[PDB]
Design a protein around this ligand. Structure first.
Ligand SMILES: Nc1ncnc2c1ncn2[C@@H]1O[C@H](COP(=O)(O)OP(=O)(O)O)[C@@H](O)[C@H]1O
Ligand SMILES: [Mg+2]
Length: 760
């Protein structure tokens, strides 16, 4: 009798149906007699009879729907059970605090070789299933960790990496290098954003490579779309990359003196953002007084259960030593970081009777000196490169143009430093050859803000391509197998998004190719590019002018000042200002030759009509990644962010419900529950057992031996279904399936003995 009906903040609330009308049901909230509210018939769902219970797999619910799914994960979350299955897919709700012992070495060991379902749901079980599938099927695997910013993708990626290296490594230094590589990549690629104190400003695919004996041989890290705009400016609640703050907070006085460092408020590239450190009562006392900004002294430290700028500087230097970085290489990295900081302090003032030129402000003399010394440049060549343009003739730059040249040089040097760090991490765990890998995908999903630039365009483009892979693997390929096998599974359909992908990436006509054309034109213009997009895709349903928007913020945006992409995740209005600049990865020749000719070998090595397409470079990287995903077995982890406050024990029902819907988790519930995640051919099963069989068993047709096997073991018509050529096992039947598949001679002989006795 009790049902789930809508609730504005909880998603759903319990009640009883007390009336029915056209397109409505009248709901009486539980224990509130006389009180009633209306709900649309299709927004009312049956509830589980027992409101207090919780199930490890949502496929075990009597009524599986969005409301019972929400309730089950809610009850589990209130008891710190953050992991729940939907058959072989994992839901992980961010706890926002460290739950004791659930990632211990002892917990790691308890998951080794255990079938799904034998142990409570855990990220360790997803990782072990990927390893066992890799080892048995002799097929490389991918683990995809998805969700909103701050949902837990990066933490779960690291749990997977730690589980696999610790369980299936050797017990040597190399095993820890894959894990120890994290403080280093996160120092240069992560930063404080309003949604996550440890936001990943780059995407990654981390592969653990194995030999034929299924033992770790090395790793490989692929990195994508490092956010370049962050290097020079941030919003008042956000910070630049962690490294700048870890260095200012933690560097010894000797390093601080050598690098001419000071409190973060003294640097343009840090002082528009938050200048405070992540610290607690203890670590705040380890930070010297000359490192603390006036705002840190007035407002105190930033609070986080994971991040600590001083502690993280120490841990990063330890991780650098552990992976094979010599003290000289560590100092070379720090010198480049400081050089970029001092570069940003180079200020300009107008010059010329019509303000057509510029000069360095006399107060930027120290900054120019420190920058040139740290980057191995001559002060005058740097000054000239930042204030003039070569075209035979050296013409003056306007202040705005000198600011852009300094910033372009800063972004390129820093991005090249990040490429060097990722390459150096790959060099610390190399492998000449391998049989298979387990790859873990950690990339930011679909995003939209009041103002959307080239960064959002690239990540949302990425999302359109990844969403298609999810649809093709989870829905299309799965159901085609069910259909070919005559299983009669109710069909779940999707609308393909090839039209939106083609709009962005098609040869010659796609947005990326139109943008590259603009960059190659004699005088590139963001307005010329946007008009060319509109003029080319006038009849395209996924594209519109910003005036067509359902919001007042886009009303004043001109046709040549933006465009709307009608992504299936929602319409996104992109402002196309700086798209041409953001699409170019190559420095002007004057800045390139300046930095290529540095006195410093390390700087020269970072760089060992100038245009390189950011969009097409990314499209090529993404197609390489998609090739790997399509050629491997896939496992999925859906990370869920419980609230927008980074707090523990605060389950925002409607926010979580929205994630369950927008992720496609709700749409596949019936498919997952009525599906068959485990399968093997009658032929392969018969062939494995055949040498252990007496004549009475071998004389049976493969399909008939399988029926005899399953009957002898007490398996029932509920647990499995026979297809045309394969036997299929239901969700929650992984242990029974694994017992059927186990190829050990003693095991095979024993099950055959049981079949012989059963037949008598
Ligand atoms: N399982 C977990 N245990 C403890 N803290 C967690 C866990 N998952 C996430 N967190 C916390 O939430 C923060 C954000 O998680 P993170 O993995 O960085 O998100 P994402 O990569 O999805 O943006 C972490 O820095 C950490 O404080
Ligand atoms: Mg992350």
């Amino acid at each position: 009798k009790p049902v789930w009906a809508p609730h504005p903040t909880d998603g759903f609330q319990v009640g009883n149906i007390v009336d029915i009308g056209p397109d409505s049901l009248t709901i009486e909230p539980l224990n509130q007699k006389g009180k009633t509210f209306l709900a649309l018939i299709n927004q009312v769902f049956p509830a589980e009879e027992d409101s207090k219970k919780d199930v490890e797999d949502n496929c075990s619910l009597m009524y599986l729907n969005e409301a019972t799914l929400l309730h089950n994960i809610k009850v589990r979350y209130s008891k710190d059970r953050i992991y729940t299955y939907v058959a072989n897919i994992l839901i992980a709700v961010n706890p926002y605090f460290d739950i004791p012992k659930i990632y211990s070495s002892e917990t790691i060991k308890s998951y080794q070789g255990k079938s799904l379902g034998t142990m409570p749901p855990h990220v360790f079980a997803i990782a072990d299933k990927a390893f066992r599938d890799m080892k048995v099927l002799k097929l490389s695997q991918s683990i995809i960790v998805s969700g909103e910013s701050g949902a837990g993708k990066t933490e779960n990626t690291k749990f997977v990496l730690r589980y696999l290296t610790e369980s299936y490594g050797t017990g040597q230094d190399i095993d820890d290098r894959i894990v120890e590589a994290n403080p280093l990549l996160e120092a240069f690629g992560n930063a404080k954003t309003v949604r996550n104190n440890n936001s990943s400003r780059f995407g990654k695919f981390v592969e653990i490579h194995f030999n034929e004996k299924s033992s770790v041989v090395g790793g490989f890290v692929s990195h994508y779309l490092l956010e370049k705009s962050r290097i020079c400016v941030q919003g008042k609640e956000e910070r630049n990359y962690h490294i700048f703050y870890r260095l200012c907070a933690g560097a010894s006085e000797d390093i601080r003196e050598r690098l001419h460092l000071s409190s973060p408020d003294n640097f343009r590239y840090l002082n528009r953002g938050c200048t405070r450190y992540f610290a607690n009562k203890e670590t705040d006392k380890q930070i010297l007084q000359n490192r603390k900004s006036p705002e840190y002294l007035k407002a105190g430290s930033l609070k986080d259960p994971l991040l600590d700028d001083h502690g993280d500087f120490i841990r990063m230097c330890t991780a650098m030593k552990k992976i094979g970085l010599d003290d000289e290489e560590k100092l070379d990295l720090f010198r480049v970081v400081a050089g970029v900081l001092h570069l940003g302090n180079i200020d300009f003032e107008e010059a010329g009777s019509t303000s057509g030129g510029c000069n360095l402000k006399n107060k930027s003399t120290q900054a120019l000196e420190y920058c040139a010394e740290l980057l191995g440049l001559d002060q005058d060549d740097l000054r000239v490169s930042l204030t003039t343009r070569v075209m035979v003739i050296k013409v003056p730059l306007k202040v705005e143009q000198a600011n852009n040249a300094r910033d372009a040089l800063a972004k390129t040097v820093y991005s090249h430093l990040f490429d060097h760090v990722v390459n150096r991490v790959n060099q610390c765990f190399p492998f000449e050859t391998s049989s298979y890998f387990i790859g873990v995908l950690d990339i930011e999903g679909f995003e939209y803000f009041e103002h959307n630039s080239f960064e959002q365009f690239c990540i949302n483009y990425c999302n359109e391509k990844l969403q298609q892979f999810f649809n093709e693997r989870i829905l299309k390929e799965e159901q085609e197998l069910y259909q070919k096998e005559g299983l009669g599974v109710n069909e779940v359909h999707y609308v393909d998004n090839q039209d939106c992908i083609d709009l962005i990436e098609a040869r010659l006509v796609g947005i990326l190719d139109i943008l590259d054309e603009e960059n190659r034109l004699p005088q590139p213009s963001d307005q010329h590019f946007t008009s060319a997009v509109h003029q080319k895709h006038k009849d395209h349903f996924r594209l519109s002018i910003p005036r067509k928007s359902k919001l007042a913020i886009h009303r004043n945006i001109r046709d040549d000042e933006g465009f709307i992409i009608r992504h299936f995740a929602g319409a996104v209005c992109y402002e196309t200002t700086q798209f041409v600049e953001k699409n170019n990865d190559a420095l002007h020749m004057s800045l390139e030759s300046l930095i290529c000719e540095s006195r410093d070998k390390f700087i020269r090595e970072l760089f060992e009509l100038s245009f390189i397409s950011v969009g097409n470079k990314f499209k090529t990287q993404l197609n390489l990644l998609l090739d790997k995903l399509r050629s491997t077995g896939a496992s999925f982890i859906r990370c869920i962010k419980p609230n927008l406050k980074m707090t523990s024990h605060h389950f925002e029902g409607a926010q979580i419900l929205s994630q369950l819907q927008c992720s496609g988790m709700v749409s596949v519930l019936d498919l997952m529950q009525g599906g068959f995640p485990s399968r093997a051919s009658f032929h392969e099963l018969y062939n494995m057992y055949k040498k252990y069989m007496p004549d009475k068993l071998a004389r049976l047709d493969p399909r008939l031996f399988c029926k005899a096997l399953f009957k002898a073991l007490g398996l029932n018509e509920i647990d499995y279904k026979f297809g045309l050529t394969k036997v299929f096992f239901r969700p929650g039947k992984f242990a029974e399936f694994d017992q059927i598949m186990k190829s050990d001679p003693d095991h095979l002989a024993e099950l055959v003995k049981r079949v012989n006795h059963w037949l008598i």
